[PDB]
Amino acid sequence: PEWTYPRLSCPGSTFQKALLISPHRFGETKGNSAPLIIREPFIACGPKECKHFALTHYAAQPGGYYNGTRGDRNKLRHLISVKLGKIPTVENSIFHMAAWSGSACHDGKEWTYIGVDGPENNALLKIKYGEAYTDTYHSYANNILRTQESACNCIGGNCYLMITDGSASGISECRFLKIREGRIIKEIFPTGRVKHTEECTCGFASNKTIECACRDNSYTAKRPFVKLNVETDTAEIRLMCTETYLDTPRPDDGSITGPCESNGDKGSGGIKGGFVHQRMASKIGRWYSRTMSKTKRMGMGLYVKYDGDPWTDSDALALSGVMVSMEEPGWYSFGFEIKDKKCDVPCIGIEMVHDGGKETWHSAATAIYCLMGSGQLLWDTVTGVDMAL
Amino acid sequence: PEWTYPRLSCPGSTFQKALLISPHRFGETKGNSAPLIIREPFIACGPKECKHFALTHYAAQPGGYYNGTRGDRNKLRHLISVKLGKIPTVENSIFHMAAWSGSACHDGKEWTYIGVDGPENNALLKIKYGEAYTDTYHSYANNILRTQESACNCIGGNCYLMITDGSASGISECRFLKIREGRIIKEIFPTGRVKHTEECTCGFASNKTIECACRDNSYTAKRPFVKLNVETDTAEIRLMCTETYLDTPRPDDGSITGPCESNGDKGSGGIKGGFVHQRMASKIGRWYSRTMSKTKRMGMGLYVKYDGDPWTDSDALALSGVMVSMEEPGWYSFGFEIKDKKCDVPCIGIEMVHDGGKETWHSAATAIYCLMGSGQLLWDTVTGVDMAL
Amino acid sequence: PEWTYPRLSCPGSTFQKALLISPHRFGETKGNSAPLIIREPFIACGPKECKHFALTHYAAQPGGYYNGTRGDRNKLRHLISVKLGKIPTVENSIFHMAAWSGSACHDGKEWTYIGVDGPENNALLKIKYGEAYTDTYHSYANNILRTQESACNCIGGNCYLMITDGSASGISECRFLKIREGRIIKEIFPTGRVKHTEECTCGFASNKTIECACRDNSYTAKRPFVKLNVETDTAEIRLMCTETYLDTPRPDDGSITGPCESNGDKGSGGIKGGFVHQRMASKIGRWYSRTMSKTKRMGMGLYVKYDGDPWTDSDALALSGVMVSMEEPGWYSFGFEIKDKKCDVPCIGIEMVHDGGKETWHSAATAIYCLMGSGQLLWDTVTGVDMAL
Amino acid sequence: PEWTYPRLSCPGSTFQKALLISPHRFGETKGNSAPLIIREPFIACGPKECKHFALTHYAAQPGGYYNGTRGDRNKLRHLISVKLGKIPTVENSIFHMAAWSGSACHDGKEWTYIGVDGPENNALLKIKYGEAYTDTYHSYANNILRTQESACNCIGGNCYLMITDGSASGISECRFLKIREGRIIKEIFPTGRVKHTEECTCGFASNKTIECACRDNSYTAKRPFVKLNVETDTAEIRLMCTETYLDTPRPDDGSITGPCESNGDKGSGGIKGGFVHQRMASKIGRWYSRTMSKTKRMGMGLYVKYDGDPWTDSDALALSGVMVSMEEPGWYSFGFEIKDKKCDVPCIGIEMVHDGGKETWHSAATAIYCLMGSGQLLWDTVTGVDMAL
Ligand SMILES: CCC(CC)[C@H](NC(C)=O)[C@@H]1[C@H](O)[C@@H](C(=O)O)C[C@H]1NC(=N)N
Ligand SMILES: CCC(CC)[C@H](NC(C)=O)[C@@H]1[C@H](O)[C@@H](C(=O)O)C[C@H]1NC(=N)N
Ligand SMILES: CCC(CC)[C@H](NC(C)=O)[C@@H]1[C@H](O)[C@@H](C(=O)O)C[C@H]1NC(=N)N
Ligand SMILES: CCC(CC)[C@H](NC(C)=O)[C@@H]1[C@H](O)[C@@H](C(=O)O)C[C@H]1NC(=N)N
Ligand SMILES: *[C@@H]1O[C@H](CO)[C@@H](O)[C@H](O)[C@H]1NC(C)=O
Ligand SMILES: *[C@@H]1O[C@H](CO)[C@@H](O)[C@H](O)[C@H]1NC(C)=O
Ligand SMILES: *[C@@H]1O[C@H](CO)[C@@H](O)[C@H](O)[C@H]1NC(C)=O
Ligand SMILES: *[C@@H]1O[C@H](CO)[C@@H](O)[C@H](O)[C@H]1NC(C)=O
Ligand SMILES: [Ca+2]
Ligand SMILES: [Ca+2]
Ligand SMILES: [Ca+2]
Ligand SMILES: [Ca+2]
Ligand SMILES: [Y+3]
């Protein structure tokens, strides 16, 4: 086998509903299954297989370890996976490493797995290549060293990963690691609007550029937007200019006054956002998702824009379809690409969290939408799960 | 590996009982298993593996999602599979795509998976090649776009698939899609008796011709019969002329007066029917199955006729044996072929539904009969399942 | 790959305890497993894998299908397997075909599976090669056509199988089938003491000869003994002359007066018996097993004799060790050979039935003994199962 | 494939927390899983896979066979394994052989499995290569013949294994077996301090030498230390001279007066200890672990020393980090190495026993620490398990 590279996307002009992974449809008291309790799911694909990753709390439904499953970080949390299409139960899953923050990617020869754990003030990112633990990176701002909760991206054997460190309420200046065969060979320090960047959802816009739509959890409801040049290994960050603000919470569309760079209102709090590239011969599409509600983690709409510069274009994003109605939960969302025989298929996945508060279990389903055929997006996704059962 | 083609059937002159997949033998309250709730099962084989497909309601027995499992279409419904011989439980199965109507087939190099979902008045057929979503086809009569519920058929890398759209009570004019490596490369519009055609059970009569025995759900208890020329890509449809009417409901054998084309009575309602080819050097056998009861979905008898033209032959089909007694359920039935080292083995499968009404669960066992050796068919199949447990 | 042949056995002069498969250690009300209800287990090995087969009643423990699990034949009974070392549960097992009498063997390229079902007066043997059903054999005495309940034996791609038909109380004259790539290419009619032969436990004494230790269920507690010449395809049967009578029930050792051919007393009833070959350069060992009790299916001792002719040798078999104490159940026993890199390892397996009558479940564990190292046999086997749980 | 040899360790200067296998997180009454009840876990890796071994009592939680799970040897005990990362449940595991003492190792081509069973006064070590049972070794002091409870060590196809036999309270003079493709080709009798040696944790210090840190269960809290020359096949044993005594129980560090060879106090009782090598170009690191408590099986600290001779160096071992706090259980510990593409990764594993006395179940989790990156060891491990559930 050989190193992989991004290719032209497969033909298409609309996303459709592809596949639901709702493990908790089998978690009843009256049933006989063991779906794992998770959050922060995401998908990453190699040349033959797509794997479905998540961060488990090392407990199952039904069970007696529900207390603490709404928490973010503890000493039991682990990165797990199954082959996409399999239900992530106790027996089906594989446990990769301890982690309360994760990522993964295939370089064409082998899987790289990324997981952060350790204490608040001095967390530690850990890298695993196939079966071997190979390297680490240390906390540099001593406040919850952190990573993407989605697929890293490899080209020509060089995989690029976003990390961040700092206060969830204040400054969190992100970096990028460049990783080869499980080992870190360069640190990349972005320039520009670097005040606060988290949980970048990243992909290839071409053989030369990686772009990421990220989260600012303090200052703005506009998404920070990264452009990484992989030939010179330099990165730059500015806010997205569109009036279709992609974060949650957010104010009404277009109501932030000033030029592209203004923050301005309802900027504290946030959500991880979906983002994927459609690469055509002489054109590029950018697909994004955002909650249906402006304040709450409910619903998910798909949006799209062809060409232009997301840093300077104030034009509204075209609303493509409703993937999750307002009456269903829409939490984190992410992008990934499936590898067809001669082309790549852009997809958006959506974490659909079963939230009933800290007094019962806390987990999530995963809905998948991909570019397929022509026309308009046709159907939405429900989890089907009743949390009383 | 290479493209596959239909070959000469293996030696034999009778079918026998081969294998039972009864997953609900393990769904007791007192047991510890998780068989999936399903309907519309079917089998499709490649050069090394046979896969057992079905449409699940994304629920398991025992469990608490029984409400709605008698319904036909919803947002949870999925195409799933196991390796034939494995019990399709939560953990054993793989989820391919969302769908409330399906099909699948191997072309010699890779699996093609077909699934239709979306709303009543604008459903959408979706195609997946290996792991990649690759193409779609749109509803053309805006009333439940629909497919075979059985194996498509691939020759020289070209796979052929029946679809239909229209009123289940009126006109539903079917088409055929020609699919290559996951993408549609021709639409085929049949000529002749096209008034109403559904759920074609299709196979190769030779390297030149695919034939299908289908369902008219409005007009007649004679099965519509398709002949598709795969060299010119043309298709023709006329009613089966035999006095052994294969649908359910149906009137007494031979009691429809007039020539081969007459409808005539008890034509509204219907069932998907089994049909498979036995290809010999200078002879062709056509095997078919039909319920034992004329009105009800009870029992299944196997029938056979050698040579002739099913469009013009009014001769009765030879009753070969009882596969399911009048006291066991006989719902959908289908054909498929297993690939031995140098020849193909024709088989008929039978969906045996556990029906207790809308107030409890609704699923199915699957019984398999295949051509093996000489003599007469010897034993019937029971599910063994008591629905109270 | 290539056709396999028997080779010289690996070095050793004693059997030891190898491995226990006790699936019912996990069938408590208070546990969360699904071991399959079975009887008639046996083991067969190819060049890379050993499979553990059994005849299931298509029910599990705990469950609500216990009624009928003491019965011998019904419509739900199936040949199943797992890779030796795995617990045969609902999910772990694979269902090969319907059968209430079975056998299997690998020819070096592929697995042949054998299963009989059908009605009492007209049962039917069925053959499957890999995934394909390929041939049948018909009942010839119209009274429970029947097979080995252990491994067939393949040489140079030709596999040899014992069958029988007739009254369990009267005449049952056995035959042998010669099978090649799933198809029957010769019937072999044995000569000599053919009055009554069942459930032969067969193996290679060399590239030229297969020998089998069988069961006479009517006339005698001496085991019938088959010598099949595989070059000329001829078979002969005489009673075993040893005073160490291998059947159950049996009279005291040596107490049957007359020459080698006398029946004489306590001959009605019987059991399947273990038997395997140890092939050395200029010597041959014959290993056998028999219950510890003379009347009852309790215990199992291992016995051995080097060279001679089992038809004419009245010398006592040397008692090698106790594999199952008198306080543990000892039902069917069988032989098989494991394939090490350059030599074959003889083994004896023992069905260890959990019998509590017709009012509760009925299944079995499987204990395995193999030739390994030097000295004497050291330890016995218990199932560990309490049937009340 | 080819024979494997030890290589240079991967780059790094500190261990970190890698992975937790806590199967009993899923053993609640309220849950639906079946983790196996085990003790004496260990890990061993080949060129593509790491397998997680243990000795089971052939019982699961929840279940009704808890009585006897605190015992050390019985007739049900078995060597089992899963792929490292999988939860060892009933279905996931594979049963290798009957054993109440074990070991295993890969030689580059195939897996060797070692298991001891049999009675107290005449136990028997059994060897299995891939699927075949191949050899045995007999008890030589007639008191619980015994082995490592950790990975054996293979070079150029020759695998080396420690065994012992004798009184747990008196003399137990260990030997080493040299094993090739499943068969013993040399016995090696160590010279020097041979009074009492058990459960050696062994690894390669180079292509020439194997070193083992072992357990004296009678005489001393200093660990006996073995040096095996694999070119001459000779072995020597002397006590570790360090003032950082690695056994439990043990007296205060440094308080055993006299030269390197003195016993002296609190020597009766003991524990199996972690030990692994870090092989660099011109330097060697020795990593070790020991309980946090001096008297009890609580906690586990990691210690390190570079170069010197452990037989004569009285210098204190450098304390590297706390792997398990004093409030968590710290039982057996062991070394292994994962194979990266071009270098080997040293790791320590820790058995973390759920002990609630003889009146309830007795089993263990497994925590894994590996050499990765630079800095200091950052986080500890908890099992998460409440034994009341
Ligand atoms: C405090 C920093 C947060 C990111 C802005 C926080 N991430 C971590 C690593 O703790 C996320 C946030 O608190 C939760 C959310 O917003 O859903 C998930 C949570 N993410 C994870 N538990 N992996
Ligand atoms: C309304 C059109 C019907 C076919 C004639 C209908 N098909 C769909 C796609 O809904 C079938 C029919 O109503 C049910 C049956 O007859 O068993 C099954 C049902 N089939 C499926 N649920 N796939
Ligand atoms: C009546 C003929 C018997 C052989 C002598 C009988 N075999 C069959 C196929 O029914 C066996 C016998 O009755 C039972 C036993 O002896 O344990 C098992 C039983 N064997 C199986 N159920 N496969
Ligand atoms: C009597 C000899 C002991 C070794 C010093 C004893 N070993 C055996 C093989 O029984 C160990 C010891 O008693 C128990 C322990 O210390 O944890 C485990 C126990 N080890 C195992 N059950 N494998
Ligand atoms: C990127 O590079 C490789 C050649 O190195 C090429 O085959 C591929 O088509 C390129 N990708 C795109 C999107 O053009
Ligand atoms: C169909 O075509 C191929 C050659 O292209 C041939 O090998 C095969 O035998 C043909 N099928 C039949 C049924 O004759
Ligand atoms: C049987 O035949 C093959 C050669 O055809 C040979 O390799 C093998 O050693 C022979 N078996 C015995 C037991 O001698
Ligand atoms: C040991 O031997 C092989 C060559 O036989 C070599 O490739 C390897 O590097 C050696 N190991 C060490 C630790 O130097
Ligand atoms: Ca924000
Ligand atoms: Ca009709
Ligand atoms: Ca008898
Ligand atoms: Ca000690
Ligand atoms: Y399972």
Q: Give one DSSP letter per residue of D247-307, joined into a string.
A: SSS--STT---SSTT---SS-SS-----EEEEEETTEEEEEEEE-SSSSSSEEEEEEEEES
Q: B-chain residues within 8 Å CB-CB of A31?
A: 34, 60, 62-64
Beta strand spans in C118-250 (E): 124-129, 132-138, 146-147, 153-155, 158-164, 175-180, 183-188, 191-192, 198-204, 209-215, 224-229, 234-239
Q: Which two tokens stand for residue C42?
A: 């046996």
The rounded distance, in Å, linking the Cα atoms of D49 and D43 is 11
Residue A385 in contact with residue A354, Cβ under 8 Å? yes
Contact C76 B20 (CB under 8 A): yes
Chain D interface includes A357 (CB < 8 A): no
What structural domains and CATH numbers belong to chain A? 1-389 (2.120.10.10)
Residue nearest to atom 1 of ligand 6 (CA): B207
The rounded distance, in Å, linking the Cα atoms of D105 and D85 is 18
Chain D interface includes C28 (CB < 8 A): yes
Element (H, E) at A347: strand A344-354
The rounded distance, in Å, linking the Cα atoms of C338 and B54 is 39
Chain D interface includes C370 (CB < 8 A): yes
**Comparing C-alpha atoms, which of A376, A258, A251, A270 is closest to residue A332?**
A270
Chain A interface includes B95 (CB < 8 A): yes
**C62 cis-preceded (ω within 30 degrees of 0):** yes
Chains that touch C (3 or more CB pairs under 8 A): B, D
Residue the block writes with tokens 């003991």: D270
Residue D76 in contact with residue D116, Cβ under 8 Å? no
The rounded distance, in Å, linking the Cα atoms of C189 and C258 is 28
Q: How many residues does chain C have?
A: 389
Residue C258 in contact with residue C314, Cβ under 8 Å? no
**Comparing C-alpha atoms, which of B66, C87, A29 is closest to residue D60?**
C87
Q: Does ligand 7 have an atom closer than 6 angstroms to the CB of C157?
A: no
Chain A interface includes D85 (CB < 8 A): yes
Residues with Cβ within 8 Å of residue B42, at least 6 apart in sequence: B52, B53, B54, B102, B103, B104, B149, B150, B151, B334, B336, B349
Q: Does ligand 4 have an atom closer than 6 angstroms to the CB of D171?
A: no
Chain D interface includes C323 (CB < 8 A): no
Residues with Cβ within 8 Å of residue D127, at least 6 apart in sequence: C372, D112, D113, D114, D133, D134, D135, D136, D137, D179, D182, D183, D184
DSSP string over C158-179? EEEEEEE-S-TTS-B--EEEEE
Is D72 assigned a catalytic role? Answer: yes
Chain C interface includes D133 (CB < 8 A): yes
**Comparing C-alpha atoms, which of C59, C106, C61, C100 is closest to residue C84?**
C106
Q: Which two tokens stand for residue A62?
A: 């039904």
Q: C-chain residues within 8 Å CB-CB of D138?
A: 373, 375
The DSSP secondary-structure symbol of D196 reads B
Q: Does ligand 4 have an atom closer than 6 angstroms to the CB of D149?
A: yes
| Residues 30-59, chain A, touching B (beta carbon < 8 A) | 30-33, 45, 48-50
Residue C361 in contact with residue C62, Cβ under 8 Å? no
Phi and psi, residue D125, nearest 5°: -90, 135
Question: Nearest by CB to C87, which of D62, D90, D124?
Answer: D90
C-chain residue closest to B46, CA distance: C131
Provide the β-strand partners of residue D339. D344
The rounded distance, in Å, linking the Cα atoms of A4 and A10 is 16
Q: Which two tokens stand for residue B116?
A: 């239709």
Which residue among the candidates B137, B332, B344, B369 is catalytic per the annotation?
Answer: B332
The rounded distance, in Å, linking the Cα atoms of A73 and A144 is 10
| SS3 state of residue B81 | strand
The rounded distance, in Å, linking the Cα atoms of C364 and C385 is 10
Read off the amino acid at residue B145.
L
Other CB atoms within 10 Å distance of the CB of residue B13 = 14
**Comparing C-alpha atoms, which of C158, C147, C84 is closest to residue C116?**
C147
Phi and psi, residue B264, nearest 5°: -110, -60
Q: Is the dihedral of CA D337, D338, D342, D343 positive or negative?
A: negative
The rounded distance, in Å, linking the Cα atoms of B155 and B203 is 11
The DSSP secondary-structure symbol of D180 reads E
Which residue among the candidates D129, D245, D303, D332 is catalytic per the annotation?
Answer: D332
As annotated, the binding site of D for Ca(2+) includes: 216, 220, 247, 267, 269
Question: Nearest by CB to A90, which of D89, D374, D378?
Answer: D89
**Comparing C-alpha atoms, which of D301, D239, D248 is closest to residue D271?**
D248
| Residues 182-221, chain B, touching A (beta carbon < 8 A) | 182
**Comparing C-alpha atoms, which of B153, A184, B60 is closest to residue D373?**
A184
Read off the amino acid at residue C237.
I
| SS3 state of residue B23 | helix
D-chain residue closest to A61, CA distance: D31
Which residue among the candidates B72, B253, B307, B340 is catalytic per the annotation?
Answer: B72
* Segments in C300-386 forming alpha helices (H): none
The DSSP secondary-structure symbol of B121 reads G
| SS3 state of residue C135 | strand
Contact C136 B373 (CB under 8 A): yes
Question: What value, to the nearest 5°, has the Cα angle with vertex D137 and ends D132 and D143?
Answer: 135
Ligand 4 pocket mutation pick from D146, D163, D268 by most atoms within 8 angstroms of CB: D146
Residue B245 in contact with residue B222, Cβ under 8 Å? yes
The rounded distance, in Å, linking the Cα atoms of A75 and C269 is 64
Read off the amino acid at residue D311.
W
Residue A18 in contact with residue A369, Cβ under 8 Å? yes
Contact C131 B338 (CB under 8 A): yes
Q: Which two tokens stand for residue C382?
A: 């218990």
Q: A-chain residues within 8 Å CB-CB of D84?
A: 131
Read off the amino acid at residue D317.
L
**Cα A88 to ligand 13 centroid, rounded to whole Å:** 12
Residues with Cβ within 8 Å of residue D67, at least 6 apart in sequence: none
Ligand 5 pocket mutation pick from A3, A4, A5 by most atoms within 8 angstroms of CB: A5
Q: How far is D30 from chain A (nearest CA, A)?
A: 5
Contact A379 B76 (CB under 8 A): no
Residue the block writes with tokens 């030689």: D107
The rounded distance, in Å, linking the Cα atoms of C40 and C79 is 10
Residue B155 in contact with residue B6, Cβ under 8 Å? yes
CA atoms within 13 A on the CB side of C172: 27
**Cα B103 to ligand 9 centroid, rounded to whole Å:** 45
The rounded distance, in Å, linking the Cα atoms of D272 and D270 is 7
Contact B34 A20 (CB under 8 A): no
Q: Which two tokens stand for residue D208?
A: 């020439």
Q: Does ligand 3 have an atom closer than 6 angstroms to the CB of C72?
A: yes
Read off the amino acid at residue C153.
N
Residue the block writes with tokens 């994004």: A288
The rounded distance, in Å, linking the Cα atoms of D66 and D68 is 6
Ligand 4 pocket mutation pick from D38, D42, D72 by most atoms within 8 angstroms of CB: D72
Q: B-chain residues within 8 Å CB-CB of C119?
A: 378-379
Residue nearest to atom 22 of ligand 4 (CA): D72
The rounded distance, in Å, linking the Cα atoms of D67 and D59 is 10
Question: Nearest by CB to C28, which of D64, D94, D132?
Answer: D64
Residue B59 in contact with residue B363, Cβ under 8 Å? no
C-chain residue closest to D62, CA distance: C31
**Comparing C-alpha atoms, which of C135, C113, C132 is closest to residue C124?**
C135
Ligand 5 pocket mutation pick from A154, A207, A210 by most atoms within 8 angstroms of CB: A207
Q: D-chain residues within 8 Å CB-CB of C16?
A: 124, 126, 133, 136
**Cα C71 to ligand 3 centroid, rounded to whole Å:** 9
Question: Nearest by CB to B340, which of C119, C129, C138?
Answer: C129
Q: Does ligand 6 have an atom closer than 6 angstroms to the CB of B310?
A: no
